[PDB]
Every structure is written in structure tokens, then in C-alpha cells.
Amino acid sequence: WSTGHSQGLVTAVTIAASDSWDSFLKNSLTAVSLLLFIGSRCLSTYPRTSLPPTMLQDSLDNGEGRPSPMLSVRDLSIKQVEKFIEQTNSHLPREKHIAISLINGARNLVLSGPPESLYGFNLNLRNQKAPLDQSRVPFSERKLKCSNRFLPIFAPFHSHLLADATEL
Amino acid sequence: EITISSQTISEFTHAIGNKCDAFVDRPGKATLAPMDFAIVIGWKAIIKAIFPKSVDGDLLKLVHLSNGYKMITGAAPLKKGDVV
């Protein structure tokens, strides 16, 4: 069988639809046209904007990358990451909310939304996390560690922001 | 009399390279228009000033020396749908 990630699933179904080389070129045309439409419509629906330089500077000077519409968080469960999104969403309006974009594993997640919303998210996560040499601390009372960073992407895939791009 | 439209603000912002969030249509947000759109709105009136006979000169030798904007105190920025 075959499948794909956030973007590769179309290629997976196309390869499943493969045939002799002449039909394979048509299959490739189909996949390429579909991805072209997806990308163009998603960007038109949610074009990324300028990002406040003070905000990216604050993000950068705390061991963080450039803010992106997706924020990967590792070493945390879906339930903990979800509770943090619920805090951020409760304190954000619905239209700049954060939602679970993809669950790469038990301790690997990526969350979609506006870069500003995910920066505030990362502020909250940095406040709650620890840098710490906790070997001398009991495991039950040990602070949780995590290495969260923004992925290299310019679109919040798997989010309500691009939901209105669907019908188009 | 010109009515401000999201299409016009989009074209103007992409033209000048303005990527600011306030001028891009987002849900639950009052999309605004840049103050540089003021010269677009008032180009007709402003540029009609140099045409009269009593102000005579070579328009091909015309040189724009300076331009500036000034918001009135308490006046909100221009936004979509504004009839101006």
C-alpha cells in the first residue's frame, strides 16, 4: 500500500492510480495540477503577512527559530499540548485560534495557526518549560523538557484558516 | 467619490511590497487600507492643481519634490468599504 503526510497523500493516491509510462505522465499531470490548485487556493485564502520584527527578535533571542504558521512541539503528549492550545485559544479570538494540525507521534506534534498566535503559544510554553540537571530531583516532581521549533513552511495546513479554501 | 475595496488594497499592497497584516483580508478582522492609499484616492484632485494656465510649466520637466501625509487627531485609519 501507499500513503502520505500533510502533502504527500495526493502523490500516494496518484501512484496507486499509476499505469504504463504514458498513463504515468497523465497521473503526474493530475497530481501536479491538484497540488498547484491546493497551494494557490490556500495562499489566496490565507496569504502570510509581514511579521513584527520585535516579535521575531524576541522569539530568536530565546533559542527559537523564525515564526511560521506551523509550530512543532516534541517530548509532550497530545493531551498536554492540547491543554496548552485550549489556554491559548480561550485567550485568542476564534479567527486566530490554534488547532492540532498533525500528530506525528505520541511525543511529536505540529500545530497550525497564525504565526503570531503560535508565537504567543511558544511564549506560554517557554514560561512553563525548563532549560536544568534534574537528576538530583525525584522523577514525580521533575519539570518537563521539550524542544519546540517552527517548521519551514508558509501556510497553516490542517486548520480552519484554509477551510474556506476547500470549496474553492 | 471613491469607495475603498479589498481588491484595490490588495493590488496596492502587492504593488508597493507592503506585507502588513492590517491590510490583508482575515476573518474576524476589519481589514484596513494603507495611508499611501490616500495618494491613490486623491491623485485626481492633487494632480489637477498643476494644470491651470496661471501655473504654467513643462510637465515633462515636472519634478515631484516632496510628498507627505498627516492624520487628523482622533481620526481612524481608512478601511474597507469606506466611501471617501
Swiss-Prot record, chain A:
Belongs to the fungal fatty acid synthetase subunit beta family. Fatty acid synthetase catalyzes the formation of long-chain fatty acids from acetyl-CoA, malonyl-CoA and NADPH. The beta subunit contains domains for: [acyl-carrier-protein] acetyltransferase and malonyltransferase, S-acyl fatty acid synthase thioesterase, enoyl-[acyl-carrier-protein] reductase, and 3-hydroxypalmitoyl-[acyl-carrier-protein] dehydratase. [Alpha(6)beta(6)] hexamers of two multifunctional subunits (alpha and beta). Disulfide bonds: none annotated. It comes from Candida albicans (Yeast). The chain holds residues 256 to 425 of 2037 of the full protein. The active site is at S6 (for acetyltransferase activity). This is Fatty acid synthase subunit beta.
Curated annotation (Swiss-Prot), chain B:
It comes from the Eukaryota. [Alpha(6)beta(6)] hexamers of two multifunctional subunits (alpha and beta). Fatty acid synthetase catalyzes the formation of long-chain fatty acids from acetyl-CoA, malonyl-CoA and NADPH. The beta subunit contains domains for: [acyl-carrier-protein] acetyltransferase and malonyltransferase, S-acyl fatty acid synthase thioesterase, enoyl-[acyl-carrier-protein] reductase, and 3-hydroxypalmitoyl-[acyl-carrier-protein] dehydratase. Belongs to the fungal fatty acid synthetase subunit beta family. This is Fatty acid synthase subunit beta. The lineage of its organism: Eukaryota, Fungi, Dikarya, Ascomycota, Saccharomycotina.
